Amino acid sequence: AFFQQQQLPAAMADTFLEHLCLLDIDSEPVAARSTSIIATIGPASRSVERLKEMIKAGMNIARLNFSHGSHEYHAESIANVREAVESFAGSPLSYRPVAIALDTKGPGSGGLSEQDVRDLRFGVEHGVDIVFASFVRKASDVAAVRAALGPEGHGIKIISKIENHEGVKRFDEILEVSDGIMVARGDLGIEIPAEKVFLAQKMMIGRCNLAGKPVVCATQMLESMITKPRPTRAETSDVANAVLDGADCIMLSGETAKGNFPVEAVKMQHAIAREAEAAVYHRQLFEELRRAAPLSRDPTEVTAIGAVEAAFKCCAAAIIVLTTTGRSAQLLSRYRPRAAVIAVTRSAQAARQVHLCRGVFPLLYREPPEAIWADDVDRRVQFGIESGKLRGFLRVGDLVIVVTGWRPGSGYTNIMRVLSIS
Amino acid sequence: ELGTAFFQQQQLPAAMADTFLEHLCLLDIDSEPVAARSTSIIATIGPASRSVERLKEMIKAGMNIARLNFSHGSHEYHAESIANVREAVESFAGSPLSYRPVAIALDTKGPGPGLSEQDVRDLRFGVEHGVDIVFASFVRKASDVAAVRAALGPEGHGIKIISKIENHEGVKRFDEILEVSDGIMVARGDLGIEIPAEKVFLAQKMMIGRCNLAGKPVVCATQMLESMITKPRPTRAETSDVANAVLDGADCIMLSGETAKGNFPVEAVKMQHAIAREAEAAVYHRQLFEELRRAAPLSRDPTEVTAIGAVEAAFKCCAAAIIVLTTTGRSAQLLSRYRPRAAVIAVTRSAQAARQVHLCRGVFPLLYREPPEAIWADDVDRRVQFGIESGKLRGFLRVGDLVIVVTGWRPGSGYTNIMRVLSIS
Amino acid sequence: GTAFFQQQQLPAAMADTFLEHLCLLDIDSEPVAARSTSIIATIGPASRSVERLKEMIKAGMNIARLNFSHGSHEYHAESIANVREAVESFAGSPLSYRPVAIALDTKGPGSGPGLSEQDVRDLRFGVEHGVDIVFASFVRKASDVAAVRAALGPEGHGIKIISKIENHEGVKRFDEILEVSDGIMVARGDLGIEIPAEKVFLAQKMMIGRCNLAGKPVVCATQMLESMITKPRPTRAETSDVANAVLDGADCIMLSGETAKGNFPVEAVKMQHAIAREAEAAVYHRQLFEELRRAAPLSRDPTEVTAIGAVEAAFKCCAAAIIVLTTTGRSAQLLSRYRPRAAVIAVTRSAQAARQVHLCRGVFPLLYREPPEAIWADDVDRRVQFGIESGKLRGFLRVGDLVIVVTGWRPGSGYTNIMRVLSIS
Amino acid sequence: RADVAQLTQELGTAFFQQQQLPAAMADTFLEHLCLLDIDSEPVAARSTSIIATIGPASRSVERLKEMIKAGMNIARLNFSHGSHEYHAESIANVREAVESFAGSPLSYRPVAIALDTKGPGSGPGLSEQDVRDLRFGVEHGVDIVFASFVRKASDVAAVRAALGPEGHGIKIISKIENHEGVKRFDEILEVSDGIMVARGDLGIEIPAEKVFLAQKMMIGRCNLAGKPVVCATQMLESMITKPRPTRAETSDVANAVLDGADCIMLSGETAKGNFPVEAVKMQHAIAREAEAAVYHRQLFEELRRAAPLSRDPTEVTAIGAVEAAFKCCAAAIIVLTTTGRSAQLLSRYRPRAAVIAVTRSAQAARQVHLCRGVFPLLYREPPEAIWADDVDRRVQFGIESGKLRGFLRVGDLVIVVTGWRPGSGYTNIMRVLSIS
Ligand SMILES: O=S(=O)(NCc1ccc(S(=O)(=O)c2cccc(O)c2)cc1)c1cc(O)c(O)cc1-c1ccc(O)cc1
Ligand SMILES: O=S(=O)(NCc1ccc(S(=O)(=O)c2cccc(O)c2)cc1)c1cc(O)c(O)cc1-c1ccc(O)cc1
Ligand SMILES: O=P(O)(O)OC[C@H]1O[C@](O)(COP(=O)(O)O)[C@@H](O)[C@@H]1O
Ligand SMILES: O=P(O)(O)OC[C@H]1O[C@](O)(COP(=O)(O)O)[C@@H](O)[C@@H]1O
Ligand SMILES: O=P(O)(O)OC[C@H]1O[C@](O)(COP(=O)(O)O)[C@@H](O)[C@@H]1O
Ligand SMILES: O=P(O)(O)OC[C@H]1O[C@](O)(COP(=O)(O)O)[C@@H](O)[C@@H]1O
Ligand SMILES: O=C([O-])C(=O)[O-]
Ligand SMILES: O=C([O-])C(=O)[O-]
Ligand SMILES: O=C([O-])C(=O)[O-]
Ligand SMILES: O=C([O-])C(=O)[O-]
Ligand SMILES: [K+]
Ligand SMILES: [K+]
Ligand SMILES: [K+]
Ligand SMILES: [K+]
Ligand SMILES: [Mg+2]
Ligand SMILES: [Mg+2]
Ligand SMILES: [Mg+2]
Ligand SMILES: [Mg+2]
């Protein structure tokens, strides 16, 4: 029965053709949904009660579109998101962190506009986790956004939006200096021929997967759901194909910001992503990611590949990782394990930001410290297990891979352990 | 010999990649498609696309198959639609550069437990009006196909039956349905109501894979460019859907309300044409051909053996085309199953086979009507040169190009056993 | 039949990994195919008798090597005459006649920088006596090959030059030597003295791989069955060495003292024949063909394009043979480079080409002696039928087998362009 | 280039020219062959063990010391010749030569003692002489038994029964010497600790031209099972009378190592030949060259794909450690082992990194020579009061011996494999450590 669920017969196939032939509509997904959902906040999704329903439906990142509304409007949106998120903090083992992302207006006819400098400063002052930088055309555009965030905003992630021919052509230099990329298909589909957008999307997703950096697929994914309760056949296909391409995040714009069915749009993306993740051909995917990733003398990099290899060998239910900045969880995520990467962190910001990496489930550790560091480590590992059992990731008898470091502080991950649950 | 510019077009750097990941990374928006569009476009005929003048524009835009939806309209209405399609098609008989055969497909209303009374009458109408294809609605088991086959009476056994998979039972009994059908249509509209909407992509990808493995045509249908019923440009999800259906391995892509009742039927055909061309160049032939090769069982049928040898030869020299002589379309279909990058120019004396080969990806039919030569080998050479001269006229070929020529050792269907490498003079 | 798929290591050949392939090797799986790796026997006092040479031809000797390091021109002329007398004693039965090449192995440069004066005299002797191949000793650079070519003069243009790599400089300048040579010999005797003995296997495997990639013949030579000079059976290391040279990809295997001066020259040839047959069935064609196909560059040469198409077609139907008409042996060589499992039966009128094609693995030469038919297409058909009748007589073919037939569109060398699937009747 | 560029800048182009690294990074087996370089020197320690047969030519304590220095890892006693008194003196001479180097524990080399039985002869099962010889082996503390002419699983059960309750730790390596042994191979391997391809008798029992098929098949199946396989007989035969081997003999040794043999053997070459030490030196030289020429890229992928999924933490830690070692070009994998099992599970994935096995068991240290790439270190220190400190001391002993023998240098990365509690069967931890 275990080997009939989550497309396991299709995953064991020797060729991609055989894998496609073995896909079964009756094979139910069992793993937790790995691809994060970014929902744009607007009139249709601004109330605290509506936001609680969207968090329950699967929203992981709240997007504020600074192309519309005043700073006062966005500050109220941020406050409503935080109020809805903290209404579930009473149960720490099931609490779900939600990242706040600021999408800039852009340069327009102009480098960095004066409105963008003011909006970026607003973001730092209001503690946003991510910036979706509009119309990035070169590496210097990223440096300008980084400078406008100042010294108080060093920790904010910059996701560069590729929206035109120049951004596509200078992609490598942009990715090198960015934390991740957004395939902004709306403007891209106007700037380049509409029939070429799929080539740009597939290329950028592939290069981001190669680099181990987050990639977001955005715009018109479930467009008809702005007015209709069910999407079209092309829309469900689009969401499934973005997940199959290798997108870490999928986004909703008007579907959540102004549409009549914002919660239903989030539920639909959740349902499709789960089905598409089970249909991923891990046999060739892991081999290609493994082969393409360069040799490394960094112990976090070395422990990550060893842990993902160990997880596949035993069909581990999860990889529990201790992370300060989210980096150790990101290096596990780049190898696309089938096992959930449960990231136990004390940093509330890192817990929100790791939603950018596919298959990373953040757990914000709010338990008292232990005097002995070794006891403190084991306690964070046990917290990971208890929250995993509560959320359905783990059961007694399961095997897990535990990834820790040899000394406190970020940058010292070097240990992988095989642990039997209970 | 060919130049650096040649190897930068039609995603050739991405096609030469050693891994699928590298192939994706090398896809270039500046790499222009050069080959002719190989995925056929099926357009549904209705009030928005019924006039002879409108049909001429749709033929010019790229329509290869005209679909008549028997769920609406009378026999008199559909007979007028058929006559208008044939009039628009025959208006280009004077120009060899513009003439293109167009298949006529009858989509049945559907079942009740088995074949309905109206379906029996509509199938009979199809035989009487010389339709080429039947899109059989709600096929659930092999006996449903046998009923449609029996209804195609004594005169209609040459009509192709494309079974529409629209429900859970059709998906579950897929192998037995495909075995007795000529091809499959992934009818996503009803399938998306019968099974959870989020599972349709699994059924589509599975059916396309199994049809590619069997070497039988597969059509992807419904809501591909839905928003173009009222808007002049499609959404980002719609262009993605068309591209992904072509990348999945669909032989045909379809337009329903977009052409039957929408405000932009010609623009919807142009959009599918443009996306299919881009997606065909992005196909990863290196692994695709190896997997089609490995999955296909060993064969002692000379047509099947010649076809794989010809596709291998075409890839080795970057052949501009594979010219094949075919009476039933079978030789062109067996070439098409290996997904060559070279166009398969099928020269035939059968008008029906010329229309029906539009079901197979990459087959470009040429109807030959010259009186037969007394010496058979001269008749063969005349048809081979007809294919070369038409290929030059349409832009597929130039002097100095290499073509692969597929023929048999004696006249009559079923004896293909020869593959020649010819230099265009 | 099930019995067919149990023989010639077919279960091991169908394996998905090389590890599974090794695990499926069966000592009870008997080889069925004809032995494809040629045996070169060095001629000497133990193998000069016309009666002894007839037994060696029957045992499997394909090339007779004359070592010009020993004996006078008078001695070698008598060796040539004895070989030709033994070879021609079987010419009364043209369907079973076996051509035998004569190769001249030069003395070498010695302490000198380039071509010695004795080598110039020996090379002219070879041209005057009609030798087919030259095994050029101690080739260190491309200019050494050019000097051998110049010493053969205008009359020795058709002689094949196989460069012997016997020292560190030859290994280091391998690419430039292979580019100008017709093939290579891994001369392990001197190589094992010039470089550390424990590194010879790396040089052998490297040179065989590069020759396989270039599609040029490679010979593995020296001490393969050394103990058989005095003992009737070889050691376990010796049989392993022969099997591994064949598995590495050697086109030819050689006997030196074993045939020139030993007590068991016929048995040494029989032993190499027996081992080579077993090792050829154990070749993992699934990965080998895929890698040869992938590594070979794209080509606009019709012989090159037809060869890959014909090898692909032969694998698709498990063809018993590929019958090829050739004037210079080039069409058979281009088939051979893809390492088909099917025997390459080469029909030629050139007695020299028939002898020289023994350098290419899996090429079985048939010398056609009939004067031409007035109609060229009938002359082509008669030769193809001669190929089939010889194949049936020798055990390569049976009624019901499938064969691939490779021919050209006009007479003369260089115009091969047709591949045909034929059923044996 | 991009997948090795940063590591090439760090370790240097000279690092990536040695030990056939350009050939190992090739995308196809054809390219791998084309890139083999005679100028690419082997850097790693020799990982295929050498078994030398002891006889009149190699019996003296002084001769045995030279053979230990030349590379002998296992001493074979052929019970087809000589009395129990003769073999007891051979055992005593081997132990005396081995212990003459015990003064330096960081460089001491353990040597296993193997008893090769006479066989059943005309009989159906275990002979009476075999029962007496097997009892002699237990009484004299032999580490391994090479059981002659094993034809079915019941033959190995009989050998195990004849070893009694005191010989439970002795490894049984079944010799496949005839058609029946080849045909019933799977049932024999299942109950044996390993296999020996006994080519001498096999080459008489089956056609000589088919022995290579049996050798390659058995080596492949043993590699798949993760059990030791020995290639034996006539490997360097001409060295019985000549100082240098033939071209076929060096080729045979190299091909046995390339096939996947854990051990290579010398019979008459050491037992009665004129050049026993030179024969050991030649096998050492060839094995080093052949190990560097192994195509790890496809080999590791095939061993991973063929090995079934496992819920055993030792099994899971071993594959994770070998994957980690390949990612950073680790100089070694240091493993703590009681029975040798954890080192054996690392060895089955054929890492390029040396598997330095630290053990307190003198028998396990001798027996791990059966597994390719396992370098045993016998730890003689008394236990620390705190178990975690005792573990750390053992790991440091592995690093210090590794630096002393040339396996490790400051700046190298090492993979350390340990367990969570004392006793055999609890290996579950993999650590990446930088050598200081
Ligand atoms: O899982 S993968 O290894 N799939 C590789 C893959 C994909 C396409 C092709 S193919 O050669 O395009 C092809 C298409 C149809 C039938 C065929 O026989 C072959 C061959 C191999 C993969 C590798 C990547 O690097 C990537 O970014 C995405 C995916 C992927 C994952 C799951 C899917 O369902 C599809 C693609
Ligand atoms: O080293 S390997 O990865 N090589 C695999 C391998 C071996 C042979 C072939 S092959 O297809 O026979 C080939 C391809 C190209 C050129 C040739 O001359 C031969 C393809 C791939 C290997 C993989 C295994 O899983 C294994 O158990 C053993 C060996 C191996 C051992 C000894 C050899 O001589 C060769 C390979
Ligand atoms: O993922 P990051 O940011 O590198 O953090 C991983 C770190 O977490 C730890 O496991 C625990 O460290 P802390 O005690 O500081 O929380 C470290 O040993 C390791 O370096
Ligand atoms: O594709 P089909 O229907 O099998 O037709 C292929 C047939 O066409 C030919 O190439 C030419 O035949 P005709 O001259 O009868 O048209 C035959 O040799 C071959 O058998
Ligand atoms: O392999 P080669 O030397 O190029 O010979 C191939 C030639 O043999 C043929 O098949 C037969 O030609 P001939 O009639 O001259 O023998 C030609 O069509 C072809 O060009
Ligand atoms: O390889 P084996 O025989 O299973 O031994 C591995 C064992 O060695 C250890 O690392 C250390 O154990 P000891 O302290 O008993 O020597 C254990 O944690 C582990 O179970
Ligand atoms: O800004 C965006 O997200 C776009 O243009 O698609
Ligand atoms: O009938 C159709 O085409 C459907 O249901 O999708
Ligand atoms: O010359 C040779 O044949 C040799 O040196 O091996
Ligand atoms: O007994 C043996 O060792 C043999 O036959 O090789
Ligand atoms: K914006
Ligand atoms: K209908
Ligand atoms: K010579
Ligand atoms: K014995
Ligand atoms: Mg935009
Ligand atoms: Mg329907
Ligand atoms: Mg020499
Ligand atoms: Mg024996």
d(CA A390, CA A5): 21
d(CA D218, CA B109): 64
In a domain, D34, yes or no: no
**Taking the CA atoms of chain A, what radius of gyration do you get in angstroms?**
21
Q: Which residue, among C74, C52, C2, C10, has the nearest Cα to C268 in the 3D structure?
A: C52
Q: Which chains touch A (3 or more CB pairs under 8 A)?
A: B, D
Q: Is D226 annotated as a binding residue?
A: no
d(CA B254, CA B206): 18
d(CA A52, CA A89): 12
d(CA C320, CA A150): 76
Q: How far is the CA of D94 from the centre of ligand 14 (A)?
A: 19
d(CA A27, CA D126): 55
Strand order in the sheet with B343-348: B363-367, B343-348, B321-325, B402-408, B416-423, C416-423, C402-408, C321-325, C343-348, C363-367
Chain CA centroid to CA D319, Å: 19
Residues with Cβ within 8 Å of residue A61, at least 6 apart in sequence: A36, A37, A38, A39, A98, A99, A100, A101, A130, A249, A355, A356
Q: Residue D338: helix, strand or coil by DSSP?
A: coil
Cβ-contact B295, A17 below 8 angstroms: yes
Q: How far is the CA of D327 from the centre of ligand 2 (A)?
A: 22
d(CA C42, CA C174): 25
- Return the structure tokens found at B157: 């056994």
Q: Residue A206: helix, strand or coil by DSSP?
A: helix
| Cα of A241 to nearest chain B Cα, Å | 7
Same domain, A255 and A292: no
- Count Cα atoms within 13 angstroms, Cβ side, for B213: 20
Same domain, D169 and D240: yes
Element counts in chain B: helices (H) and strands (E): 18, 13
- Return the structure tokens found at D155: 């033959």
Terminal Cα distance for chain A, rounded = 23
With beta carbons under 8 A apart, name residues in chain D contacting C284: none
Q: Is D177 annotated as a binding residue?
A: yes
> Which residue shows structure tokens 């039988």?
B216
Q: Is C329 annotated as a binding residue?
A: yes
Q: Which of A168, A185, A284 sits opposite B29 (nearest CB)?
A: A168
In a domain, A242, yes or no: yes
Chain CA centroid to CA C282, Å: 18
d(CA C4, CA C317): 13
Instruction: List C-alpha distances in Å: A158 to A132, A200, A216, A330, B178.
Output: 6, 20, 12, 15, 50
d(CA B250, CA B39): 7
Same domain, D210 and D330: no
d(CA B120, CA B113): 14
Q: Which residue, among C38, C236, B121, C205, has the nearest Cα to D210 in the 3D structure?
A: C236
In a domain, A5, yes or no: no
What 8-state DSSP symbol labels residue A294? P
d(CA A362, CA A343): 5
CATH of the domain at B197: 3.20.20.60
CATH of the domain at C294: 3.40.1380.20
Q: Residue B168: helix, strand or coil by DSSP?
A: helix
d(CA B69, CA B257): 11
- Return the structure tokens found at C55: 């037994």
Instruction: Say if the Cβ atoms of A294 and D3 lie within 8 Å.
Output: yes
Cβ-contact A331, B59 below 8 angstroms: no
Tell me which ligand sits closest to the C-alpha of residue A221. Answer: 7
A vs B: CB pairs below 8 A: 194
Q: How far is the CA of A191 from the centre of ligand 15 (A)?
A: 10
With beta carbons under 8 A apart, name residues in chain D contacting C222: 247
The single-letter code of the amino acid at C22 is L
Instruction: Give the total number of structural domains in chain D.
Output: 2
Chain CA centroid to CA D99, Å: 21
Same domain, D133 and D161: yes
Strand order in the sheet with A360-364: A360-364, A340-345, A318-322, A399-405, A413-420, D427-434, D413-419, D332-336, D354-359, D374-378
Same domain, D151 and D275: yes
Cβ-contact B247, B279 below 8 angstroms: yes
d(CA D265, CA D271): 11
Experimental technique, in short, is X-ray
Q: Which of B222, B237, B287 sits opposite A238 (nearest CB)?
A: B237
Q: Kindly state if the Cβ of A253 falls inside 6 Å of ligand 3.
A: no
Q: Which residue, among D180, D182, D176, has the nearest Cα to D194 in the 3D structure?
A: D176
Q: Which residue, among C389, C337, C385, has the nearest Cα to C363 in the 3D structure?
A: C337
Q: Are strands D354-359 and D332-336 parallel, antiparallel or unpaired?
A: parallel
d(CA A103, CA A133): 6
Write phi, then psi, for B96 (nearest 5 degrees): -60, -25
Instruction: List C-alpha distances in Å: C321 to A196, C324, C336, C415.
Output: 48, 9, 12, 21
Q: How far is the CA of C230 from the centre of ligand 10 (A)?
A: 23
Task: Please report the atom of ligand 2 found closest to the CA of residue D297.
Answer: 3
Instruction: List C-alpha distances in Å: A320 to A304, A326, A376, A422, C90.
Output: 11, 12, 15, 15, 79
Torsion of CA A159, A164, A168, A169, to 10 degrees: -130
d(CA C26, CA C79): 42
Q: How far is the CA of C272 from the centre of ligand 2 (A)?
A: 23
Same domain, B196 and B297: no
d(CA A310, CA C57): 59
> Which residue shows structure tokens 């949904």?
A33
Q: Is D342 annotated as a binding residue?
A: yes
What 8-state DSSP symbol labels residue B152? T
| Cα of A295 to nearest chain D Cα, Å | 5
* Domain finish residue from C280, C308, C341: C280
C59-62 contacts at long range (C-beta below 8 A, 24 or more positions apart):
C59/C266, C59/C269, C59/C270, C59/C273, C60/C35, C60/C269, C60/C270, C60/C272, C60/C273, C61/C100, C61/C259, C61/C269, C62/C38, C62/C98, C62/C100, C62/C101, C62/C252, C62/C358
Cβ-contact D265, D77 below 8 angstroms: no
In a domain, B398, yes or no: yes
Instruction: List C-alpha distances in Å: C86 to C52, C54, C258.
Output: 9, 5, 20
Contact with chain B for residue A93, Cβ under 8 A: no
- Return the structure tokens found at B307: 């076809």
d(CA C345, CA C324): 6
Task: Please report the atom of ligand 7 found closest to the CA of residue A219.
Answer: 6
- b vs e for D149-168, b when ≥16 Cβ sit within 10 Å of the residue's Cβ? bbbbbebbebbbebbeeebe
- Count Cα atoms within 13 angstroms, Cβ side, for C268: 31
Q: Residue B304: helix, strand or coil by DSSP?
A: helix
Q: Are strands D427-434 and D413-419 parallel, antiparallel or unpaired?
A: antiparallel
C vs D: CB pairs below 8 A: 194
> Which residue shows structure tokens 């082996």?
D137
Instruction: Say if the Cβ atoms of C305 and B317 lie within 8 Å.
Output: yes
Q: Which residue, among C57, C70, C87, C50, has the nearest Cα to C260 in the 3D structure?
A: C70
Q: Are strands D263-266 and D49-54 parallel, antiparallel or unpaired?
A: parallel
In a domain, C196, yes or no: yes
d(CA C211, CA C319): 26
Instruction: Report the sign of the C-alpha dihedral through residues A80, A83, A84, A86, in that order.
Output: positive
Tell me which ligand sits closest to the C-alpha of residue B107. Answer: 12
Same domain, A125 and A261: yes
Q: How far is the CA of C120 from the centre of ligand 9 (A)?
A: 20
Write phi, then psi, for C414 (nearest 5 degrees): 95, 5
Residues with Cβ within 8 Å of residue B48, at least 6 apart in sequence: B54, B259, B260, B261, B262, B263, B265
The single-letter code of the amino acid at D298 is Q
* Domain finish residue from A276, A310, A343: A276
Q: Which residue, among D409, D376, D352, has the nearest Cα to D110 in the 3D structure?
A: D376
Task: Please report the atom of ligand 6 found closest to the CA of residue D359.
Answer: 16
d(CA B49, CA B263): 10
* Cβ under 8 Å to A: B residues 258-277: 271, 274-275, 277
Residues with Cβ within 8 Å of residue C371, at least 6 apart in sequence: none
- Return the structure tokens found at C311: 């090898």
Q: Which residue, among A13, A99, A1, has the nearest Cα to A59 in the 3D structure?
A: A99
In a domain, A391, yes or no: yes
Cβ-contact C151, C109 below 8 angstroms: no
d(CA A349, CA A129): 7
What 8-state DSSP symbol labels residue A227? T
With beta carbons under 8 A apart, name residues in chain A contacting D415: 306
Q: Give the residue whose CA is nearest to atom 20 of ligand 3.
A: A412
Helices (H), A136-261: 139-148, 165-169, 171-177, 185-191, 197-211, 233-245, 254-257
| Cα of C361 to nearest chain B Cα, Å | 22
C-alpha angle C29/C33/C39, rounded to 5°? Answer: 110
In a domain, B159, yes or no: yes
Instruction: Say if the Cβ atoms of C309 and B305 lie within 8 Å.
Output: no
Write phi, then psi, for A183 (nearest 5 degrees): -85, 95
Q: Which residue, among D176, B240, B326, D419, has the nearest Cα to A418 in the 3D structure?
A: D419
In a domain, B209, yes or no: yes
Q: Which residue, among A324, A368, A316, has the nearest Cα to A343 in the 3D structure?
A: A324
Q: Is C70 annotated as a binding residue?
A: yes
Instruction: List C-alpha distances in Å: A142 to A165, A212, B90.
Output: 17, 18, 59
What is the H or E stretch that residue D316 is in?
Answer: helix D313-328
d(CA A104, CA A64): 9
Chain CA centroid to CA D283, Å: 13
Contact with chain B for residue C20, Cβ under 8 A: no
Find residue B13's DSSP bridge partners.
Answer: none
Same domain, C419 and C275: no
Cβ-contact C229, C259 below 8 angstroms: no
- b vs e for D390-410, b when ≥16 Cβ sit within 10 Å of the residue's Cβ? bbeebbebbbebbeebebbee
Chain CA centroid to CA A279, Å: 18
Cβ-contact C411, B400 below 8 angstroms: no
Tell me which ligand sits closest to the C-alpha of residue A216. Answer: 7
d(CA A116, CA A122): 10
- Return the structure tokens found at B126: 């199809």
d(CA D79, CA B58): 91
Write phi, then psi, for B10 (nearest 5 degrees): 40, 40
Same domain, C133 and C276: yes
Chain CA centroid to CA B301, Å: 23
Same domain, B161 and B272: yes
- Return the structure tokens found at C166: 């016997």
SS3 of chain C: helix, strand, coil, percent, to 5: 45, 15, 35
What is the H or E stretch that residue D294 is in?
Answer: none
Contact with chain B for residue A234, Cβ under 8 A: yes
Q: What would the DSSP string read from start to end of C190-209?
A: HHHHHS-GGGHHHHHHHHHH
Same domain, A171 and A38: yes
Instruction: Say if the Cβ atoms of B239 and A199 lie within 8 Å.
Output: no
Same domain, A193 and A245: yes
Cβ-contact B423, B402 below 8 angstroms: yes
| Largest Cα–Cα separation, chain C | 62
* Domain finish residue from A276, A293, A310: A276
Write phi, then psi, for C56 (nearest 5 degrees): -70, -35
Chain CA centroid to CA D305, Å: 23
Task: Determine the structural domain holding residue B229 and report its residue range.
Answer: 40-280
d(CA D5, CA C425): 60
Instruction: List C-alpha distances in Å: A252 to A37, A239, B325, B401.
Output: 8, 11, 52, 50
Tell me which ligand sits closest to the C-alpha of residue C191. Answer: 9
Find residue D76's DSSP bridge partners.
Answer: D53, D114
Q: Which chains touch B (3 or more CB pairs under 8 A)?
A: A, C
Beta strand extents in C225-372 (DSSP E only): 252-255, 321-325, 343-348, 363-367
Task: Please report the atom of ligand 8 found closest to the CA of residue B187.
Answer: 6
Q: Kindly state if the Cβ of C416 falls inside 6 Å of ligand 5.
A: yes
Q: Kindly state if the Cβ of A325 falls inside 6 Å of ligand 3.
A: yes
